Design a protein around this nucleic acid. Structure first.
Ligand SMILES: [Mg+2]
Ligand SMILES: [Mg+2]
Ligand SMILES: [Mg+2]
Ligand SMILES: [Mg+2]
Ligand SMILES: [Mg+2]
Ligand SMILES: [Zn+2]
Lengths: 136, 50, 175, 112, 86
RNA sequence: UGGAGGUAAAGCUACUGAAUGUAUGAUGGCGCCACCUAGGCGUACUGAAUACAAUUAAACUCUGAAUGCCAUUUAUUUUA
RNA sequence: CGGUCGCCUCCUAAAAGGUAACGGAGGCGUACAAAGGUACCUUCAGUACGGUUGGAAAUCGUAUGUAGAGUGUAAUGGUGUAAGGGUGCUUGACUGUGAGACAUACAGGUCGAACAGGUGAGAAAUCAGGUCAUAGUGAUCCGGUGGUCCAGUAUGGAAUGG
RNA sequence: UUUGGUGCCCAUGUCGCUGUGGAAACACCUGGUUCCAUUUCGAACCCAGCAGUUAAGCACAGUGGAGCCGAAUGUAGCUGCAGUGAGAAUAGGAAAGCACCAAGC
């Protein structure tokens, strides 16, 4: 579970992901990267599931770089309660993912194996994924 | 509230002209300044008044 | 005076030792300071007066005591409560109180063999520490209940430390 | 650390800042510069940043007790009918030679 | 049934004093009018303008009002008043 | 037409928090021998500090618009 | 039931100003005869080398650094030759006023040139009507206290009022 | 025109590195007995003297090291799919500039 060790302010404004990927536009460390075509919020749990999928299918030869991180927290009002009279406690952390952010990327392992690893990863994430390759 | 203020009065004519603030707990000394007095028309020594 | 020997020989000596052709590229000794660090005045042991008097006795400079510029809870020294003392002596006093050490005091040390191999700053300064002020002649046996040392420095007008080597060697210091 | 001359320039900057902020009338400021060898004076007319008159030891005088750099500048300004100035010690202190200059300047028809 | 909540502890704030700019450029002003209201000198007083101990930029003579750039990276703002052709 | 401003956006060896990797590796922890104290050995790891590449922010800012605003110019209109 | 009830600063507040919510964070019900006013002088903290007691860290001199220091206190804004630190002298922590503006439903709040009296600092210009700025406080009635070129139920006083 | 002083400008003005010069000037320097002064001291302030100095400050030439500045194109946001146009990045500039005064020129 990825989680900031400690944050300044516990209850911040939600960040709309409707943009075109300020930062992380392009793959930067490996040969192949996973891109999104619809911005969304993927929490720490989904990052964990994607990471473990890539690691399990990667074998003991290659490397995986995670680019996004659940910097932002998020709240959830307890159930069966009227509205108002405060702001609910923070529950789960989430990484904002704009459209077109290369979030995962792999290295040092055959081509087809990397494509399969990325496909096995992007099925855990809600964002409609896509495959990009490093430039030259 | 805390009633920390105090009043200064001239000594020649004994009016109670001025008002100021003084914290007794540190400097127990009675203030003795010299300021303008409207009756006396000059700078006279003012000293504290209860 | 030791200044006599300097202004008689040293200028020519170190001018010829290093190819300068500038009579005062030779290093010049600029000031000397004395510090003790009287920290046994937690609140008031003797309130530093013994230190002030004895340091007045050794040097013609009137001693001055510095106030703490920090706040330390580990001791009773926070934001005030002056500790230590400081002399910054010069003129005839600088040259004379210097030799008065090297010709009187250091032969009277517990063991004066050698130093200054590694005590240079590397920018033209030097320091000497003394573990007890009772050794020096300008004092009687009576003192504070504790006897402390001294911190003295030699700062010159050159930044290259080998020049300081040359100046202090030309002045016959114990290396 | 400082060079005894950049520091003096700094004190002068302090003084000129106070003057340029405070001088509500258009009084011409009378700057004196003190050098180890001798002394000089110039009268900066602010609000136009030009110089009106000046004086120095180099008016065929000797090495600066030479308050003569006061009488001549007093004459030059009173010929311009201003005679209401404000003094400027550069970075120096209003003492010694500067005082001997300023008093001579005052006692010949100036008002400052 | 109901549910347990309470203790917001953050329902407080202060009146908003209307600090900002009062005379923009080009304005003809008379001595005593306040040009600029601020907390701390966001604008320095230039020529023919005084500063009131509330850090208030207020005029001292008739004339057109002008803002200007100065400072170590041309990021500080001066305000000043220019006399007319008198 | 001139001007105040610090948003959208952008950026983070330009500070504050958060924070990914490679290289150098300190602080340490696992062992470890001498020695009973001052300490050495390689550290599957936590990562001081720095370099190189790459990130996030309503209460982060070295930077930064357009619209809007203020006042003024010119033309026209309205007596509100 | 619980919480809150006035005032102050930031964010929300959409680059003027304003702008709600049981929206997000926090403070005040002051403190200082010097932490006021003025003249003069002086300008970081930190780190590295160097040095008896003395230690991670006191102090000492040296350089380095461009503010991470300080600024009585909450946060913000501003301020490195300042509005910060030291010193000498004082008390303008004045009286009587107030053109012209700000922001305002009213009440109230805020800023202030300039003028007269008599001062302090200073060679002089100048500065000073409390502090770097923003909170630090509560109407009216009633009654009391001090001064008085006010009246005093026929007159002189007094009581009682002003 | 060059030297010195100084105001305006706020780094394309700096920080530094290598050399050149000091007649007049600017500092250094020499003394502290005087006016004056150090939380202590002729360090500094302040006097009165210029024997020696180009060492250092100051100026001048070269230095593309750090720091600083930064075009065009293209892009992001905008405001009724065209005009508006940044930031970051880049080529690249850059060893300051504007005046007045006194000297010898
Ligand atoms: Mg944004
Ligand atoms: Mg103050
Ligand atoms: Mg205060
Ligand atoms: Mg206050
Ligand atoms: Mg009667
Ligand atoms: Zn009286």
């Amino acid at each position: 579970m990825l989680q900031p060790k400690r944050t300044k302010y516990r209850k911040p404004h939600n960040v709309s992901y409707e943009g075109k990927a300020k930062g992380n536009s392009y793959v930067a460390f490996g040969e192949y990267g996973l891109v999104a075509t619809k911005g969304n919020w993927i929490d720490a749990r989904a990052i964990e599931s994607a990471r473990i999928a890539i690691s399990k299918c990667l074998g003991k030869t290659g490397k995986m770089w995670i680019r996004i991180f659940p910097h932002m927290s998020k709240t959830k009002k307890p159930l069966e309660v009227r509205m108002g009279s405060g702001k609910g406690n923070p529950e789960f952390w989430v990484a904002v993912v704009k459209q077109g952010t290369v979030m995962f990327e792999v290295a040092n392992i055959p081509e087809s194996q990397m494509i399969k690893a990325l496909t096995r990863a992007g099925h855990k994430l809600p964002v409609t994924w896509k495959i990009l390759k490093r430039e030259e | 509230a805390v009633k920390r203020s105090t009043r200064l009065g001239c000594n020649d004519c004994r009016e109670i002209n001025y008002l100021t603030f003084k914290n007794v707990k540190k400097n127990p000394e009675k203030l003795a300044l010299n300021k303008f007095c409207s009756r006396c028309r000059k700078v006279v020594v003012h000293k504290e008044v209860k | 005076n030791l200044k006599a020997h300097y202004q008689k020989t040293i200028a020519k000596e170190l001018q010829k030792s290093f190819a300068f052709s500038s009579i005062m590229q030779v290093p010049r000794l600029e000031k000397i300071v004395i510090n003790m660090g009287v920290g046994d005045a937690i609140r008031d042991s003797k309130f530093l007066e013994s230190a002030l008097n004895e340091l007045h006795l050794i040097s013609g400079q009137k001693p001055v005591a510095t106030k703490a510029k920090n706040a330390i809870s580990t001791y009773k020294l926070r934001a005030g409560q002056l500790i230590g003392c400081k002399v910054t002596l010069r003129g005839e006093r600088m040259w004379a109180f210097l030799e008065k050490l090297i010709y009187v005091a250091l032969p009277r040390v517990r063991d004066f063999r050698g130093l200054s191999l590694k005590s240079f700053d590397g920018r033209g300064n030097y320091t000497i520490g003394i573990k007890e002020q009772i050794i020096f002649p300008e004092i009687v046996y009576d003192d504070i209940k504790r006897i402390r040392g001294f911190d003295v420095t030699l700062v010159t007008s050159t930044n290259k430390d080998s020049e300081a080597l040359a100046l202090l060697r030309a002045l016959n210091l114990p290396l | 650390m400082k060079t005894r001359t950049e520091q003096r320039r700094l004190r002068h900057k302090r003084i000129v800042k106070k003057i340029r902020a405070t001088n509500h009338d258009n009084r011409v400021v009378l700057m004196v510069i003190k050098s180890l060898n001798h002394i000089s004076v110039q009268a900066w007319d602010f609000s136009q940043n030009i110089v009106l008159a000046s004086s120095s030891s180099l008016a065929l005088k000797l090495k600066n007790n030479a308050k003569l750099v006061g009488q001549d500048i007093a004459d030059k300004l009173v010929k311009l009918k201003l005679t209401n100035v404000v003094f400027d010690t550069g970075g120096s202190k209003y003492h010694g030679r500067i005082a001997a200059l300023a008093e001579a300047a005052r006692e010949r028809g100036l008002n400052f | 049934s109901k549910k347990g909540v309470g203790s917001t502890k953050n329902g407080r704030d202060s009146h908003a004093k209307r600090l900002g700019a009062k005379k923009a450029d080009g304005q003809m002003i008379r001595t005593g009018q306040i040009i600029y209201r601020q907390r701390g000198t966001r604008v320095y007083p230039g020529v023919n303008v005084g500063l009131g101990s509330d850090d208030t930029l207020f005029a001292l003579s008739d004339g057109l009002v002008k803002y200007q750039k100065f400072g170590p990276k041309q990021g500080k703002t001066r305000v000043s008043v220019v006399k007319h052709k008198l």
